[PDB]
Design a protein around this ligand. Structure first.
Ligand SMILES: Nc1ncnc2c1ncn2[C@@H]1O[C@H](COP(=O)(O)OP(=O)(O)OP(O)(O)=S)[C@@H](O)[C@H]1O
Ligand SMILES: [Mg+2]
Length: 767
């Protein structure tokens, strides 16, 4: 505000003082720059939601119109549009609409400086008239949206056309999913059914009955034809908006859901056939879990479009599609006939075509051979050759030496390195695997997870878990992708973006239905592995972690009164020590404070986002403490959507807020940074409930995502389902209660002793 106010004084004084200016700078030039600077200062002030400063600017701009008309300037339209924006941002919807309509009626938007296209004005009126319900959605399309597309004059590229096409597609989409229109179609459908049943009873009575029946049919044809036109315009404009600009890129997720719902309706497939080849494939690159799950060999038109799109994605962005094709052709999910012929065979045909073309031919074989040795190394468990906790050189097994040789002959980027999508299609700047460190660690389990290290070409170390056995990493990979998408939504609001509220991601890469390649997050330490030694180092007279766990597990088959009494007796001899994490890794006070502040913000963000998505299984081994930045990282995100309160001893807390987590906050225990960041996160989440619905809808058309926790993992954890889950998520984002009251309720039930006392003992709540 300080810089922008001083810049306003500067530009006005310079426009007033004629003797200070240079020779060839007339007063029209100084005025025009001044106006442009004011317009620039109004966009910035609108983002910050500073109402009084947009009001000041738009008033001071409107006062410059008389002086500007005498200098020979035509700046009425842009200045009146700035006034209309100030009105609309203060709540005057009708006054803003009337003002924009006046600009459009009597003004010459062509012959005037500070240009103003007529199609962005028309679409602006159309949007504001739809929000205010000022006209029926059949006149909005006839007066404002179709004239806009006609003013584009055949231009189908740029941000102007991008705005117009997204405007029109969102409009038509909104007209399809209309509760009134769906009720009317249902009413006409029941009418048709009942009248046909009545005609079936009787077979001038029949004559009039069948005349009424025919008129019902004509009405129903009219309604369905209206809905079909809306569908064509919706899909076509979504595709044209993706091909024009990059402002609207979650239109790829919405087009994809809309197209997989109408896979049979041949009119959608014709429109998609016509317009699909103009979208850059970098828009669909992150949707390969949903695209490769619908692959089938059926010879329809939907499949001839879907296979060609998947093929082009894997050719343009191979490190984003190749592993999905390999997994699809090397993961025999079952020998039984449960459609996977079509999925498993079609992926095999794409793989065969990939190893035939010139762009990707030094890349597919590399990924082929390397994945084969990674999977072989994963599956190889020997209790003698691999002892849990040791550090074995990977040259003594035959698997290890075949792995080393194969990886030396075939250079690829590290499989667990997160590669950003390249608009120019250049993946040469990506570090390849140079060599492997000679040894590999081993963790405790049955099928020993082995931690490899890879030294890349740029000289960095990429550690990896090579996880084998009887787990499902596709659950964890899908949920990691959903959490990353929602955290990307948080960047669009001023309060969460000012605080960098978001989550830390990692990379899960499923190779087969029994193995995968997890990224070992660089310089973290599990929360339980810090807290259990620290509790005995700082309080040598307290109980140990194992004595608390056993004491809590013994009273697991008793009445809630005895469980709560045992829990109070434990935690009276167990004091939190999480505050020492910030005093021994960061002894400098101005680093200590920034690290402690980052921990609170990263904890608050994942607490609210993990409540909205039902995230469970938040014990100490799934939470990592990054001791370079202080932030927390949540891994193992597969038990979501409330699958955790179905377990034998349910997890009935919204998130993890035990006494340690809270102790690592400070001396204002949960008030202050934690409570304010919970409220900013939850406030920005329930203003993006449409986008979160889109993301979960894309999840609904994923054949392979399981919405219940299979007893295999349910026994590994404690020693329509889509419609219910998405409905619960949708009612956690309801604006009925305020954010302050919602957060107060969550923090009450997350720290309650009667809730923490009846949790599973492996969920270390005493800690
Ligand atoms: N991506 C990762 N980055 C860093 N550390 C990880 C990562 N994945 C797992 N770990 C840690 O490495 C170990 C992996 O163990 P897991 O098999 O996930 O669970 P566990 O603690 O070994 O036993 P359970 O089944 O979780 S009770 C734990 O100490 C985790 O904290
Ligand atoms: Mg784990």
């Amino acid at each position: 505000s300080q810089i922008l106010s001083c810049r306003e004084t500067t530009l006005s004084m310079w426009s007033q003082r004629h003797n200070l200016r240079a020779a060839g700078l007339t007063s029209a030039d100084a005025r025009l720059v001044q106006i442009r600077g004011m317009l620039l200062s109004s966009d910035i002030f609108r983002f910050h939601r500073a109402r009084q400063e947009t009001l000041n600017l738009s008033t001071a701009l409107s006062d410059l119109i008389p002086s500007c008309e005498s200098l020979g300037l035509s700046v009425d339209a842009a200045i009146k549009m700035e006034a209309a924006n100030a009105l609309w941002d203060h709540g005057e919807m009708i006054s803003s609409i009337r003002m924009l309509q006046a600009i459009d009626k009597d003004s010459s938007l062509k012959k005037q400086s500070v240009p103003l296209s007529r199609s962005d004005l028309l679409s602006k009126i159309g949007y504001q008239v739809s929000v205010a319900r000022l006209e029926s959605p059949d006149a909005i399309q006839k007066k404002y949206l179709e004239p806009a597309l006609k003013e584009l004059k055949g231009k189908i590229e740029g941000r102007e056309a991008g705005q117009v096409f997204h405007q029109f597609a969102v409009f038509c989409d909104e007209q399809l999913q209309n509760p009134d229109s769906l009720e009317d179609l249902a009413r006409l459908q029941n009418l048709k059914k009942g009248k046909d049943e009545e005609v079936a009873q009787l077979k001038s009575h029949l004559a009039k009955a069948k005349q009424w029946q025919e008129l019902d049919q004509q009405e129903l044809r009219r309604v369905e034809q209206t809905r079909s036109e809306f569908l064509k315009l919706c899909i076509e404009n979504y595709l044209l908006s993706l091909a024009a600009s990059d402002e609207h890129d979650n239109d790829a997720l919405r087009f994809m859901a809309l197209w997989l719902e109408k896979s049979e309706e041949e009119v959608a497939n014709e429109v998609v056939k016509k317009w699909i080849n103009k979208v850059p494939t970098r828009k669909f690159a992150l949707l390969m879990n949903q695209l490769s799950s619908r692959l089938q060999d059926h010879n329809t038109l939907f499949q001839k479009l879907l296979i060609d799109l998947v093929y082009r994605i894997c050719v343009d962005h191979p490190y984003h599609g190749m592993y999905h094709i390999w997994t699809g052709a090397r993961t025999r999910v079952n020998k039984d006939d449960e459609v996977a012929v079509s999925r498993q065979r079609a992926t095999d045909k794409i793989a065969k075509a990939l190893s035939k073309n010139n762009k990707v031919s030094s890349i597919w074989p590399a990924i082929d051979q390397t994945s084969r040795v990674y999977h072989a190394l994963a599956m190889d468990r020997d209790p003698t050759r691999y002892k849990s906790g040791q550090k074995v050189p990977i040259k003594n097994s035959p698997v290890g030496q075949n792995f080393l040789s194969t990886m030396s002959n075939n250079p690829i980027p590290p499989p667990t390195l997160q590669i950003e999508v390249s608009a120019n299609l250049d993946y040469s700047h990506v570090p390849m695997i140079h060599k492997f460190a000679p040894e590999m660690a081993i963790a405790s389990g049955v099928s020993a997870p082995k931690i490899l290290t890879a030294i890349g070409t740029d000289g960095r170390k990429y550690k990896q878990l090579v996880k084998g056995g009887n787990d499902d990493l596709r659950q964890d990979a899908i949920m990691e992708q959903v959490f990353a998408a929602v955290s990307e939504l948080l960047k669009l609001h001023r309060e969460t973006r000012q605080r960098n509220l978001g989550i830390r991601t990692y990379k899960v890469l499923p190779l087969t239905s029994s193995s995968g390649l997890i990224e070992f997050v660089s310089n973290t330490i599990p929360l339980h592995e810090y807290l259990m030694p620290a509790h005995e180092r700082y309080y040598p007279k307290d109980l140990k972690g194992s004595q608390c766990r056993k004491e809590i597990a013994n009273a697991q088959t008793k009445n809630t009164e005895t469980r709560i009494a045992v829990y109070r007796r434990v935690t009276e001899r167990f004091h939190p020590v999480m505050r020492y994490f910030f005093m021994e890794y960061f002894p400098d006070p101005d680093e200590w404070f920034q690290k402690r502040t980052n921990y609170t913000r990263t904890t608050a963000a994942i607490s609210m986002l993990g409540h909205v998505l039902g995230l469970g299984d938040r014990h100490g081994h799934n939470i990592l403490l990054d001791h370079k930045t202080g932030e927390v990282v949540h891994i193992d995100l597969g038990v979501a959507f409330e699958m955790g309160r179905v377990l034998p001893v349910p997890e009935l807390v919204p998130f993890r807020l035990t006494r340690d987590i809270v102790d690592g906050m400070g001396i204002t225990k949960t008030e202050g940074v934690f409570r304010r960041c919970c409220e900013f996160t939850l406030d920005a989440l329930r203003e993006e409930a449409a986008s979160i619905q889109t993301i979960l809808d894309s999840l609904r058309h994923d054949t392979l995502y399981q919405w219940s926790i299979s007893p295999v993992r349910m026994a590994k954890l404690q020693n329509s389902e889509a419609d219910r889950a998405i409905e619960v998520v949708k009612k956690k984002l309801s604006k009925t209660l305020s954010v302050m009251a919602t957060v107060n309720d969550l923090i009450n039930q997350a720290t309650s002793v009667s809730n923490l006392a009846v949790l599973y003992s492996g969920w270390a709540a005493y800690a």
